[PDB]
Amino acid sequence: GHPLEFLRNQPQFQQMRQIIQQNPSLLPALLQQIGRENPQLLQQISQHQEHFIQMLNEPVG
């Protein structure tokens, strides 16, 4: 990926991926919370929105 690839296999991000997949409507709220808690992560997401969205939407067991 780009800089955000290291999120992919983190157990807490696997959890996040699962939740966003089951609850698409939480996407705006997720991005807004990221902006508050981790603005640098948001800045990275804004530069590579597709990659982030791709990662969120990859199924995990």
């Binding site: 157990p11 696997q14 609850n23 939480l26 709220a29 508050r36 808690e37 992560l41």
Partner: protein
């Protein structure tokens, strides 16, 4: 489930249900000076609110800080070795434990320590009571007893509260702040609130799994208590992450079947906040923060 970790999820899920007995809750309040705790909390909010520099609010948050303080200074005592029952003198641990007569079984003691007096040639018994009701009588122990009894008390006062189990043999509590819309770390044994890096950065603990348990939720809260996520991952060798998460997911889904739609919806909106925290590891400050001892 034959890993010890998965066995303790089940035990702790059960145990936490104990705080929901409304008579046990009553009796807990039989012990707490709840009005004075609340009268002192109103006063700090009064003066915090004079200088609007103090934003949002904090109110039941102020109350929480009064609870932590009292528990530590008025309610509960630490045990290293108990005094001798015959001569009042010092005792010393026997490496070989005692056997829970019967009344010690009734109150959840599986372990009983032999605190021996050499002068009297006398064994003094220190039971490790697991029934929080017993602890409201004895008012003492080590951090097992402190966290167990403190979590009962929080629930008795109407705080949402988790019993928090650390795989490295410590336990504590978390309490929800509606004002700040987030969960707060609380360690009664240590008189600390909202300092989640205390264990890794203050005590230099090498953490692996920290699991929180409430009436509503089982949550892997490990990531709140670490800024060294790769290092913690290197010690998570006890179970597959897949299996741990499916087990917790299963347990949540199962246990949340008997909550409302609106409540489940709220829990989902809140979980976004935690999970964003869990991918937002913080920066240690050993040169600034009194409780920070490690880079």
């Amino acid at each position: 489930g034959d890993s010890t970790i998965l066995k303790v999820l089940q035990s702790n899920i059960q145990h936490v249900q104990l705080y929901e007995n409304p008579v046990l809750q009553e009796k807990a309040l039989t012990c707490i000076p709840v009005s004075e705790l609340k009268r002192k909390a109103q006063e700090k909010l009064f003066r915090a609110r004079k200088l609007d520099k103090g934003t949002n609010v904090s109110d039941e948050d102020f109350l929480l800080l009064e609870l932590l303080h009292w528990f530590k200074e008025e309610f509960f005592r630490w045990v290293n070795n108990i005094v001798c029952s015959k001569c009042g003198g010092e005792t010393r641990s026997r490496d070989e434990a005692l056997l829970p007569n019967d009344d010690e079984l009734k109150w959840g003691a599986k372990n009983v320590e032999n605190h021996y007096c050499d002068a009297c040639q006398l064994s003094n018994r220190f039971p490790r009571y697991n029934n929080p009701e017993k602890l409201l009588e004895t008012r003492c122990g080590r951090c097992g007893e402190w966290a167990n009894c403190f979590t009962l008390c929080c629930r008795a006062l109407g705080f949402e509260a988790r019993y928090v189990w650390d795989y490295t043999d410590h336990v504590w509590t978390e309490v929800y702040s509606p004002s700040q819309q987030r969960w707060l770390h609380c360690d009664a044994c240590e008189d600390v609130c909202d300092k989640p890096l205390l264990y890794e950065i203050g005590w230099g603990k090498k953490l692996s799994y920290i699991i929180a348990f409430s009436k509503d939720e089982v949550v892997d809260v490990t990531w709140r208590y670490s800024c060294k996520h790769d290092e913690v991952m290197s010690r998570r060798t006890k179970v597959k992450e897949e299996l741990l998460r499916e087990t917790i997911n299963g347990l949540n889904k199962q246990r949340q079947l008997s909550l409302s739609e609106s409540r489940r919806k709220e829990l989902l909106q809140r979980i976004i906040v935690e999970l964003v925290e869990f991918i937002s590891p913080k920066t240690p400050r050993p040169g600034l923060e009194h409780h920070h001892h490690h880079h």
